[PDB]
């Protein structure tokens, strides 16, 4: 059976992608390898076994794959947070900046979150933390209480100190894998 | 316990979205309601219980959520098919047209699929079938054999006869829910 470390070994670092100067972390092989995906999924689910999560909020398409898997594994519903224009109906919005794109607008359907929810935010990679900080804000504007937000990321690039950045709004941050030094 | 019909009742039809003249099928409430998501997931997994699927290929972000859930449930890897520019590394490409967007380019990482694979393509909604037809093409260019491709969609809008369109390349098409007449 593969371990989280084995999953880690499947990650590829692609230079100058999408734009030059950006070291892209390709997590694709963890997702296409069942034993590696199970290892990472189990790590997340065990971690929140005693946390009364009511919804998993996947941050953009990048967080949909494992986000959905975790939601179904925990037995809670999944809610998508997407760039503006993709979600229909009443929505809450917020504008932010991420590692290789500045001026993005995220949205969430108003009806999917509120005061009663305990949210597990999920993102594939934690870089500058701009996307996550914006995501916490959105959840809170929708009515989720600050103390009821937890964060999970598959891969953390500690060098960019995104953790401290996000720590201004949420300090319950669990990363499955951290970039090797 | 909710049934597939109950899941169906959670779907909302949004008029003139994203552009006027388009009747958008909002599947969001099935995904945020665990009992409805379980009902649909179970329907898909039972259906392919005896099919030797080796990979689930989710068609764009729209197919990532349930696509990932099905992949992990079946115990196979998940492979993303995305619009051009989003996937890094060597890729196979193809250009198509969908209900409210003409001139889209889809891609798949070359290394994720090949001759040995039995693919379950998954898309959230089957409309004109342009996206699916293009997806089958991509899989085949990557090396997947025509007889080794199966298709699953969560919701089928039969009125647009996408099924016959896709039937030119693949006739193994299972839709969980079909639009009411
Ligand atoms: N360096 C990086 N690698 C992979 N995904 C992201 C997303 C933001 N920054 C990234
Ligand atoms: N009418 C429609 N509703 C929801 N999703 C899609 C995707 C293509 N056409 C659609």
Question: Would you kindly provide a written description of the structure presented here, covering whatever features stand out?
Answer:
2 copies of one chain form a homodimer. Chain A has 6 helices and 9 strands. The two termini of chain A are 26 Å apart. The longest helix of chain A is centred in the N-terminal third of the chain and has 14 residues. The first copy, chain A, has one domain: Rossmann fold. Chain A is α/β, with parallel strands linked by helices and 181 residues long. Helix content of chain A is 29%, strand content 31%. In chain A, helix 3 packs across helix 4. The radius of gyration of chain A is 16 Å and the shape is globular. The relative contact order of chain A is 0.16. A 7-stranded mixed β-sheet of chain A has the order 5-6-4-3-7-8-9, sandwiched between helices. In chain A, strands 1-2 form a two-stranded antiparallel ribbon. At the A-B interface, helix 3, helix 4 and strand 4 of A face helix 3, helix 4 and strand 4 of B. One 9-deazaadenine binds next to strand 2 of chain A. It is classed as transferase. The entry lists the keywords adenine, APRTase, catalytic loop, transferase.
């Amino acid at each position: 059976t593969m371990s989280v470390a084995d999953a880690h070994a499947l990650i590829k670092t692609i230079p100058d992608f999408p734009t030059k100067g950006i070291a892209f972390k390709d997590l694709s092989d963890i997702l296409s390898t069942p034993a590696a995906l199970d290892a990472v999924r189990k790590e997340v689910t065990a971690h929140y076994k005693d946390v009364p999560i009511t919804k998993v909020v996947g941050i953009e398409s990048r967080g949909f794959i494992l986000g959905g898997i975790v939601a179904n594994s925990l037995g809670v519903g999944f809610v998508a947070l997407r760039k503006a224009g993709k979600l229909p109906g009443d929505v809450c919005k917020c504008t932010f900046d991420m590692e290789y794109q500045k001026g993005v607008t995220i949205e969430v359907q108003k009806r999917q979150l509120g005061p009663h929810d305990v949210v597990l935010l999920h993102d594939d990679v934690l870089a500058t933390g701009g996307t996550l900080l914006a995501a916490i804000e959105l959840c809170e504007t929708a009515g989720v209480k600050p103390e009821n937000i937890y964060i999970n990321v598959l891969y953390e690039i500690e060098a960019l100190k995104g953790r401290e950045k996000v720590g201004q709004k949420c300090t319950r941050l669990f990363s499955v894998i951290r970039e090797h030094h």
